[PDB]
Write a protein that binds this ligand. Structure first.
Ligand SMILES: CC(=O)Nc1nnc(S(N)(=O)=O)s1
Ligand SMILES: [Zn+2]
Length: 257
C-alpha cells in the first residue's frame, strides 16, 4: 500500500493511481513572477466562529483534526469560489529537517510544513460525492516557517503523544482553527488535486501568501509521531509530502499585487 518511503512513495503512486500523471495534479511550484494578479478575485470569506472540532486521528500518513460537517458551521466562501464549502478536517505535511516539508513551493522555496484545511462543496451533499467533481473541494493551504511559536497550534502539539501510532484517535473538542491563520488572507489560486491517493482532480487550491511561524519544538513534536501501528517497528512520521508536479496547462492567479 502507498506511503512516503523509497519503495511506496510518490514515484510509485501512478501504478495504483494512474491519475498521478494527470493534467491537474498538486502540489505545484508557485512562480510568483509568473502568477498574474486578477483584480476580479474576491476576498476570501473564512467563517469559522461556529466550528465544532470532534477528534484527532493518526491515519498512518498524517494526523487529521476532524470537524462536524453535518451542518454549515465552519465554511469557506468567496475568493475564487462560487458556493459554500464546509470544513471537514485539517492536517499537515512536514519534513525531517526544517528546510523541507511543504508540498507547494514558492519560487522553489520549501517551507518546514504546510497546513491543509479541507472543505467540500455543499451542493454535492457529502464529501464522498464531492471528490468525484472538478469543483468538489476547496483546500486552504498555509505555509509554516520555523521561528516563534504559534500559540493556537499548541493544543494540537500537546495531544500528539496520545495518537502516536496509526489508527489511534483522541477527543479533540473545542478547538478553534482561527488560531492557525496568518494576519493576511491574500492568496494564490489554481485548479488541482488531492496530494495523496486517490489523487482526485477535484480541488480548487487556495494558498495563502503569508506563512505562519511555529517554533522548532512544535515541529519537533510532529516528527515524533509514527507511520506504523502500535507493536510494529518504529517508523517516524516525517517527510510526508508530495513534491511539486508539472503545472501543464494551468495558470496560477494572485489576489494581490
Ligand atoms: C478526507 C480527505 O481530506 N482526503 C484528502 N486526501 N488528500 C488531501 S490534501 N493533502 O490534498 O489536502 S485531503
Ligand atoms: Zn494535505
Amino acid at each position: 500500500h502507498w506511503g512516503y518511503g523509497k519503495h511506496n512513495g510518490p514515484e510509485h503512486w501512478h501504478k495504483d493511481f494512474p491519475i498521478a500523471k494527470g493534467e491537474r495534479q498538486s502540489p505545484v511550484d508557485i512562480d510568483t513572477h509568473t502568477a498574474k494578479y486578477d483584480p476580479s478575485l474576491k476576498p476570501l470569506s473564512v467563517s469559522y466562529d461556529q466550528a465544532t472540532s470532534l477528534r484527532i486521528l493518526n491515519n498512518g500518513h498524517a494526523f487529521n483534526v476532524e470537524f462536524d460537517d453535518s451542518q454549515d458551521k465552519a465554511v469557506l466562501k468567496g475568493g475564487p469560489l462560487d458556493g459554500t464549502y464546509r470544513l471537514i478536517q485539517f492536517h499537515f505535511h512536514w519534513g525531517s529537517l526544517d528546510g523541507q516539508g511543504s508540498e507547494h513551493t514558492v519560487d522553489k522555496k520549501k517551507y518546514a510544513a504546510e497546513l491543509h484545511l479541507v472543505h467540500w462543496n455543499t451542493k454535492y451533499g457529502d464529501f464522498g460525492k464531492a471528490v468525484q467533481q472538478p469543483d468538489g473541494l476547496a483546500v486552504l493551504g498555509i505555509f509554516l516557517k520555523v521561528g516563534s511559536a504559534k500559540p493556537g497550534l499548541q493544543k494540537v502539539v500537546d495531544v500528539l503523544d496520545s495518537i502516536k501510532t496509526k489508527g489511534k484517535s483522541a477527543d479533540f473538542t473545542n478547538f478553534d482553527p482561527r488560531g492557525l491563520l496568518p494576519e493576511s488572507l491574500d492568496y494564490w489560486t489554481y485548479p488541482g488535486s488531492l496530494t495523496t491517493p486517490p489523487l482526485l482532480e477535484c480541488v480548487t487550491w487556495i494558498v495563502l501568501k503569508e506563512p505562519i511561524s511555529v517554533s522548532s519544538e512544535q515541529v519537533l513534536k510532529f516528527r515524533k509521531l509514527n507511520f506504523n501501528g502500535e507493536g510494529e517497528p518504529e517508523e517516524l512520521m516525517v517527510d510526508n509530502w508530495r513534491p511539486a508536479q508539472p503545472l501543464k496547462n494551468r495558470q496560477i492567479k494572485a489576489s494581490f499585487k
